[PDB]
């Protein structure tokens, strides 16, 4: 049977683009498309796609459940058996829902997190989708209670493959392949097992307005970047790590609150070290 | 004699042709004994030698979970490698890993191994000390820094000193009468004319295990190592191997040529001649 795929993603915004490819007998040409209900009726009045089918700009009419058949001249029927099914989901058709993490977006290796999607729009289903190429979304039925619909996606035990930027979508009854605008994104980061860095203050954690204080994140491990986080959920500051003469790796964040720092590496933004011990800065 | 266990992983992307695929195979010496292939409808680690088949269900369940996890891990590593090398997600790439242990006659560890490759060239390898890495390029140097920060080598060392040795010993016992009993080659020489001044003499070794063997041609006692055609040792398909060695000889000089065969299954090295 052929292998059908959507590129770059089967989850695609209205106005975007997605291409279906039907790989069969070591070629990408000569195939027909079918949608789930009509199984022996080729779409587009039996159009024989001469190459990959580019849908662009994407409209809601593109949303659907597809299979392909590849040409097979020297066989009983003209064509192959049906491919695996690919569901093109078109986003941007309803107000966006909301996505939050419980207890939070930084998840220790091996542990679990809940990603809750919710909306005051009644969505029949919710979809959770991690940003990237060729990734499948998770689906859950929405549950109604006190004027909202919502779903809980459980993620874990936490590892790198599960880390990244997540968005959630709702779809409403009778248009299951049409998704809402995406929720605001949530970066879910895995912490550990890389060794925790050290956090310190210069000249010290006691400061009174208006004099300068720099926090330094340091490690013997060759971290490429440091992330400084202050309890209370404003997004971490980031700085490149610099190698010092005694071979430690350090970044200096010139700035109260309770802080922690994490190390990370090049090309790897969603996996961080264990958190440093906390440091309390007072003004 | 000394023995080895090795696992070999191949993880491949193939955008537009299929889902990424992960295949693992396990060998004791030259004998494959397990396989796992992510493409199977319901993938499981499966026996590929008879002496492992009676291992209990807890073994298979355990090996299967690990391979499923490993498949997942390596799918992500392919993605990571793309970022390290600034390559497009349209291209097809391969990660290969081999790891395992060698033990001596007393069953004790001689050497541990853990080597990885990206697109068929060395990427990163655990050193003989089992506590440090050799990275082949700048991309691999990122991985090295992660692994040092995560104390990966300690974990690998613990595996190599412990479970690896322990399981190899178990398998060697389970399969003793095949794995630990060398089968000597059956040998013969054939003669094939080339012109009416020259001919080929071919020395054959068949049905031997293990694969290690030496076939040499001598001419009045001097090796013709410069004028010998040596074919790659090849599997017979029944867990034995085959090889031949050929030499072009002048007509009427067949009698000065002797074929010499060395293999552990042979009591004394063999000396054959065409007749």
């Amino acid at each position: 049977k052929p292998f059908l795929s959507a590129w770059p993603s089967a989850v695609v915004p209205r106005g975007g683009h997605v291409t279906l490819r039907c790989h069969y007998r070591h070629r990408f040409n000569n195939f027909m498309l079918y949608k789930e209900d009509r199984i022996h009726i080729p779409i587009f009045h039996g159009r024989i796609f001469q190459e990959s089918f580019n849908m662009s700009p994407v409209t809601t009419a593109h949303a659907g459940n597809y299979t392909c058949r590849g040409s097979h001249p020297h066989s009983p029927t003209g064509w192959s058996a049906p491919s695996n099914p690919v569901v093109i989901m078109v986003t941007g058709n309803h107000r966006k829902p909301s996505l939050l993490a419980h207890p939070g977006p930084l998840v220790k290796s091996g542990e679990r997190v809940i990603l809750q999607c919710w909306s005051d729009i009644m969505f029949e289903h919710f979809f959770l989708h991690k940003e990237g190429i060729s990734k499948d979304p998770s689906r859950l039925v929405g549950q109604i209670h006190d004027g909202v619909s919502k779903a809980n996606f459980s993620i874990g035990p936490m590892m790198l493959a599960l880390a990244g930027t997540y968005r959630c979508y709702g779809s409403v009854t009778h248009t299951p392949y049409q998704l809402s605008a995406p929720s605001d994104p949530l970066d879910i980061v895995v912490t550990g097992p890389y060794e925790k860095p050290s956090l310190s203050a210069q000249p010290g954690p006691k400061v009174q307005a208006g004099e300068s204080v720099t926090l330094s994140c340091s490690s013997r491990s060759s971290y490429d970047m440091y992330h400084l986080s202050r309890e209370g959920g404003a997004h971490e500051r980031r700085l490149p790590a610099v190698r010092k003469v005694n071979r430690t790796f350090q970044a200096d964040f010139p700035l109260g609150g309770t802080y922690r720092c994490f190390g990370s590496f090049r090309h790897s933004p969603y996996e961080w070290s264990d958190p440093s011990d906390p440091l309390l800065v007072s003004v | 004699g000394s023995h080895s266990m090795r696992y070999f992983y191949t993880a491949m992307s193939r955008p537009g042709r299929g889902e990424p695929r992960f295949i693992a195979v396990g060998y004791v010496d030259d004998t494959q004994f397990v396989r796992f292939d992510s493409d199977a409808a319901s993938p499981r680690m499966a026996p590929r030698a008879p002496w492992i088949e009676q291992e209990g269900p807890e073994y298979w369940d355990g090996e299967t979970r690990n391979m499923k996890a490993s498949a997942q891990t390596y799918r992500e590593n392919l993605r990571i490698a793309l970022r390290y090398y600034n390559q497009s997600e349209a291209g097809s790439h391969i990660i290969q890993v081999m790891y395992g242990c060698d033990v001596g006659p007393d069953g004790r560890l001689l050497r541990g191994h853990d080597q990885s490759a990206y697109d068929g060239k060395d990427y990163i390898a655990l050193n003989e000390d089992l506590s440090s890495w050799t990275a082949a390029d700048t991309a691999a140097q990122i991985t090295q820094r992660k692994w040092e920060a995560a104390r990966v080598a300690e974990q690998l060392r613990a595996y190599l000193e412990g479970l690896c040795v322990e399981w190899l010993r178990r398998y060697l016992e389970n399969g003793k009468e095949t794995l630990q009993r060398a089968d000597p080659p059956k040998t013969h020489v054939t003669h094939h004319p080339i012109s009416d001044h020259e001919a080929t003499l071919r020395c054959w070794a068949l049905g031997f295990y293990p694969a290690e063997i030496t076939l040499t041609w001598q001419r009045d006692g001097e090796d013709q190592t410069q004028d010998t055609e040596l074919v790659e040792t090849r599997p017979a398909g029944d867990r034995t191997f085959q090889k031949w060695a050929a030499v072009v000889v002048p007509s009427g000089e067949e009698q000065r040529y002797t074929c010499h065969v060395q293999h552990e299954g042979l009591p004394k090295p063999l000396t054959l001649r065409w007749e």
Partner: peptide, 10 residues
């Protein structure tokens, strides 16, 4: 396990 149980990311 007989195979390496530790999961190792690049």
């Amino acid at each position: 396990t007989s195979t390496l149980q530790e999961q190792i990311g690049w």
